[PDB]
């Protein structure tokens, strides 16, 4: 399914049957992304202030993120505050 990532700072979420993507971002335009069932990707010029995908690998370009930029837990893949460099273009979760 396709879903639009809306910048401006409001925290938004999108889910499908479950895989959920929660984010807040800044940038010039709304971007249409896709969720495949879990892979979340931009078919990105947005600057993410936060990201969390819940039910793993994260990429700045679809180029992996540095290990320090994110954390993989029991049910989620989230940005590491203060280490995440604000660029996210693809998330892959195998559960």
């Amino acid at each position: 399914v396709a879903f639009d990532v809306r910048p401006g700072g409001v925290v938004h979420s999108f889910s499908h049957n479950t895989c959920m993507f929660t984010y807040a971002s800044q940038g010039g335009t709304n971007e249409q992304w896709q969720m495949s069932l879990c892979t979340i990707w931009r078919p990105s010029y947005l600057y993410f202030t936060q990201f969390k995908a819940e039910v793993a690998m994260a990429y700045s370009k679809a180029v992996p993120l540095k290990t320090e930029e994110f954390e993989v837990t029991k049910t989620a893949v989230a940005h590491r505050p203060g280490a995440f460099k604000a660029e996210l273009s693809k998330l892959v979760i195998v559960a």
Partner: antibody
Framework: EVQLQQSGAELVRPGALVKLSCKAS????????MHWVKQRPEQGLEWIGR????????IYDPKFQGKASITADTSSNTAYLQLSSLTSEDTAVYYC??????????????WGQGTSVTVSS | DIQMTQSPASLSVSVGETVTITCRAS??????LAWYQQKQGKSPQLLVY???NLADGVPSRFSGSGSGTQYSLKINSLQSEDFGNYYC??????????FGGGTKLEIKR
């Protein structure tokens, strides 16, 4: 009840400008895109552009060549379409319509009643 | 930009028959396709969304099918009130989220 209430018919001279309004009731405009659609007499529907009232992001079909400007006022829960350098090609009915942000919600479920614009001296 | 080609441009079908209207996208639109009905002097009305889902309050005689670039709107057991214009619209990629050229449906009697 969801309603989109558009402003009255306009009679405007060639070269002039109009600002059309679309007042939303029963929902918050920050939760949807507000789209604008043109329909020339005896012609099909043509998507003009949209605004996301939560962040003010607005985009258009390039064919309008910057002649359309879409704005929104969240306090009054109203979206607007401004058309400039009007010609006889701009004589049409203009509709506002709300739409969502994902596959199951993009399609415009609620539409305004339309505003007729006649470009004539 | 993605262009939508709607066919046929016009149809004349009797009450009780089946109507099939097709919409072809210039590239894969991944089922991000809606169908609207419009009557003279009235606003368009959503019939089908995301290629195959019936909108609230739409009669069950309406259905949508398709994937990739090819989509269809079907009207089973056509009723006299089903005359009007029908349009498809896509919601894939960077806007414009363009409409098809339309299909004019006449009731044959």
């Amino acid at each position: 009840e969801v309603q989109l209430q558009q402003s009255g018919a306009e009679l405007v001279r060639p070269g002039a400008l109009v600002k059309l309004s679309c007042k939303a009731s029963g929902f918050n405009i920050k939760d949807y895109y507000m789209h604008w659609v043109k329909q020339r007499p005896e012609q099909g529907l043509e998507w003009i552009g949209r605004i996301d009232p939560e962040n003010s992001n607005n985009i258009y079909d390039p064919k309008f060549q910057g002649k359309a400007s879409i704005t929104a006022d969240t306090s009054s829960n109203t979206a607007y379409l401004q058309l400039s350098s009007l010609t006889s090609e701009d004589t049409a009915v203009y509709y506002c319509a709300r739409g969502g942000f994902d596959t199951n919600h993009y399609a415009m479920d609620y539409w305004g009643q339309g505003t007729s614009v006649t470009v004539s001296s | 930009d993605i262009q939508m080609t709607q066919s046929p441009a016009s149809l004349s079908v009797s009450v009780g028959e089946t109507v099939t209207i097709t919409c072809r996208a210039s590239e894969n639109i991944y089922s991000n396709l809606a169908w609207y009905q419009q009557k003279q002097g009235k606003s368009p009305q959503l019939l089908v969304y995301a290629a195959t889902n019936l909108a609230d309050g739409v009669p069950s005689r309406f259905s949508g099918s398709g994937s990739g670039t090819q989509y269809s709107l079907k009207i089973n057991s056509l009723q006299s009130e089903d005359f009007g214009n029908y349009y498809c619209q896509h919601f894939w990629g960077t806007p414009p989220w363009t409409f098809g050229g339309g299909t004019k449906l006449e009731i044959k009697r």
